Amino acid sequence: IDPFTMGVITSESEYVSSLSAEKLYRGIVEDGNIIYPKALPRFIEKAETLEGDGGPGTIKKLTFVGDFGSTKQHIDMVDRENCAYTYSVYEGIALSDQPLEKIVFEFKLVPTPEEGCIVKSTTKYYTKGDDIELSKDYLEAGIERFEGFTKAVESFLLANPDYN
């Protein structure tokens, strides 16, 4: 009687990039503050880090083009060595007026013998126990926006190898 309930919905998607794991990781994680407005110019107006040096515990902020507000990313795991990166979002337009406690975004790049890499995207949606009602359309739009974000940075680096 009167139990504790919580749901975790996990979505996974992969694709094969020709870009090396190190270069893609570097563009997304280390140089994202510079890359994002140039790689996603119709979405990201500005990318900055509010607190921290980039390691676990860092808070970055993407401010959107026009009048769409902003989103704060809470960096959780950072692993340059294995091209693994993880962060959480607790509020924002990523949540899209659904009953969510948080969203975790996970990203892992695996080298391929051709010096490409496999891009592994994961989203985890955390829901309280009164309302476990998430649209199958909504769930896959989130992973699709996230993986598409990666593809846009991949597109940018492929076209601009020498962006300093």
Ligand X SMILES: O=C(O)c1cccc(C(=O)c2ccccc2)c1
**By C-beta, is 20 or 121 nearer to a second copy?**
121
Instruction: Show the tokens assigned to 161.
Output: 């190898």
Q: Say if CB 89 and CB 71 are below 8 A apart.
A: yes
Q: How many CA atoms lie within 13 A of 162 on its CB side?
A: 0
Opening angle at CA 127, ends 122 and 131, nearest 5: 135
Is residue 62 close enough to count as binding ligand X by CB under 6 A? yes
129 binds, among a second copy, ligand X, none (CB under 5 to 8 A by kind): a second copy
The residues in 122-161 that bind ligand X, with binding defined as CB under 6 A, are: 145-146, 149-150
Tell me the sheet residues that pair with 48.
Answer: 61
Q: Which residues are annotated as a binding site?
A: 73, 87, 138
User: What residues make contact with a second copy under the rule CB under 8 A?
Assistant: 1-13, 129-134, 136, 139-140, 143-144
User: What residues make contact with ligand X under the rule CB under 6 A?
Assistant: 28, 62, 85, 94, 107, 145-146, 149-150
